[PDB]
Design a protein around this ligand. Structure first.
Ligand SMILES: *C(=O)[C@@H]([C@@H]1N=C(C(=O)O)[C@H](SC2CN(C3=NCCS3)C2)[C@@H]1C)[C@@H](C)O
Length: 264
């Protein structure tokens, strides 16, 4: 749904910031949703890492050993944005520790290592289809999926699909309990999210999120919010802008969050 008061606010925000905004909020206490351009495709940038970590957790359900599998990667695997895999190069990392790094620091090497571990880009896509997500499409490895080009469907999803996937995985029954638990623990320990949905939410709430950004000033954040009263809320905000070199607008995401949460 889309209340008139939210519609006007978001449209003004979107226009003023010369961008296109995609929003999907699911309030799991009452089942109410707020949707704005929610069925349109947006470049997901690093937010895909949530779906990747979930796919690894799903794989772990039939391989109870997998999270503790030690990966001794090498310098050739290291990318420009890889702070945690860089830190642990000498000793390697477990798959669990790779999932934590790719969620909580957006480590690009950790992502590509986990894609390889799952069996390739199409394995992530098949995982998404297995939970009913028909829109998620991962087409490139890191760091090349950040091009975020106009009307390019590679490396995109819709806000509605991502929000429904986050709901099923974190708050519903798409994963077994230990796994779903683990996915939330990773999200709540995110270190990249202070300026985005967290900045728009009450200080007393707990936010677990995954950020992403890329060219075209693309600024994204997907979160589960734990309020002081009531059930958890899913919020996905995607935003992209006119020119390739536009600067990201993390404040826009914080403002979207203020607008949406005001309605709750
Ligand atoms: C993911 O979007 C991107 C990864 N993940 C990132 C993220 O932290 O969510 C960074 S993007 C980097 C953070 N940036 C800025 N923050 C301060 C002002 S500019 C740009 C990292 C590169 C993938 C697509 O590579």
């Amino acid at each position: 749904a889309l209340p008139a008061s939210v519609d006007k606010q978001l449209a003004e925000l979107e226009r003023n910031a010369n961008g296109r905004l995609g929003v999907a909020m699911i309030n799991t206490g009452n089942g109410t949703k707020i949707l704005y351009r929610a069925a349109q495709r947006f470049p997901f940038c690093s937010t895909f890492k949530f779906m990747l970590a979930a796919a690894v957790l799903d794989q772990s359900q039939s391989q109870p050993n997998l999270l503790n599998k030690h990966i001794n990667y090498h310098e050739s695997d290291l990318l420009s944005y890889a702070p945690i895999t860089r830190k642990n190069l000498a000793h390697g990392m477990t798959v669990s520790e790779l999932c934590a790094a790719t969620i909580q620091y957006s480590d690009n090497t950790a992502a590509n290592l986990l894609i390889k571990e799952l069996g390739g880009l199409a394995a992530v896509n098949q995982f998404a289809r297995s939970i009913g997500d028909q829109m998620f499409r991962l087409d490139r490895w890191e760091p090349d999926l950040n091009t975020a080009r106009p009307n390019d469907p590679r490396d995109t999803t819709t806000p509605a699909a991502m929000a429904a996937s986050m709901n099923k995985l974190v708050l519903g029954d798409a994963l077994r309990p230990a796994q779903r638990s683990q996915l939330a623990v990773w999200l709540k320990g995110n270190t990249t999210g202070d300026a985005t949905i967290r900045a728009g939410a009450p200080t007393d709430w707990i936010v677990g999120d995954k950020t992403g950004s890329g060219d075209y000033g693309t600024t994204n954040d997907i979160a589960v919010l734990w309020p002081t009263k009531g059930a958890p809320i899913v919020l996905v905000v995607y935003f992209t802008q006119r020119e390739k070199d536009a600067k990201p607008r993390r404040d826009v995401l914080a403002s979207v969050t203020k607008i949406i949460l005001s309605q709750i």
